[PDB]
């Protein structure tokens, strides 16, 4: 049973990237390297671990002109004065636009929604 | 001045994390860890 | 058993990888819905149901 | 066999007094602080069955 | 073997979201809540 497990880890952890938690090491698995040993085997599991955090204020959606804007891939955060979008596992804040967001419905059904602006890259070219 | 003691086991430290409807914690840096796993 | 509930209810899938992470519960389900091929819209639109 | 199952964590987490989770009621799975043993309603049923 | 299985479910089902079919309940797994029991453990899965 220990050998069938090691054969399963050599396939899922080494030969590929596993989304299984605590199977190919503690944390988000990137890759693993095997090493031989007497009557056994050793796995060196490389993992990604977020270390330094920072509390932020969030919200599930944004009301721009009656339309509720949800994020395509990320979360809405706030430094107390301005709102941005960022990847979940890394603070890479960037401006809220119609390309980073998705529209569905109105602002009278979502809980915790907040009013703010959404940027349209097409507008300044019209003024050119 | 040493001696053998007996006690009730502790299961680690308490951590009552923050809470709110309008709070989020995002990482800013990262740390690569390379642990070890032995299997006979 | 109670500690693992407080982490899942709060942090979801993060405390199993490293330090805990404050996330609201309604936002966790939005990401879990995305994990099954469903957008965040149907959750917040049907958060009570 | 218990440590590999239940002791998957390294630090004890706890719930807040303000249990605002967007309408989800986890009372039947969270522990009752009044009882001598701090196990939930569902846990107490399984220990009696 | 049952304990090693349960330890694998707490990592996959509880501590994370599993895309494995019928490993953390019938349906599309969202999350799981564990409960203790005499000489065992109980999982309360959540599925779409």
From Swiss-Prot, chain D:
Glycosylation sites: 25
Positions marked as site (Cleavage): 39-40
Function recorded in the entry: Precursor of the fusion protein processed in the biosynthesis of the S protein and the formation of virus particle. Mediates fusion of the virion and cellular membranes by functioning as a class I viral fusion protein. Contains two viral fusion peptides that are unmasked after cleavage. The S2/S2' cleavage occurs during virus entry at the cell membrane by host TMPRSS2 or during endocytosis by host CSTL.
Name the UniProt record assigns to this protein: Spike protein S2
Organism of provenance: Severe acute respiratory syndrome coronavirus 2 (2019-nCoV)
Positions spanned in the full protein: 777 to 825 of 1273
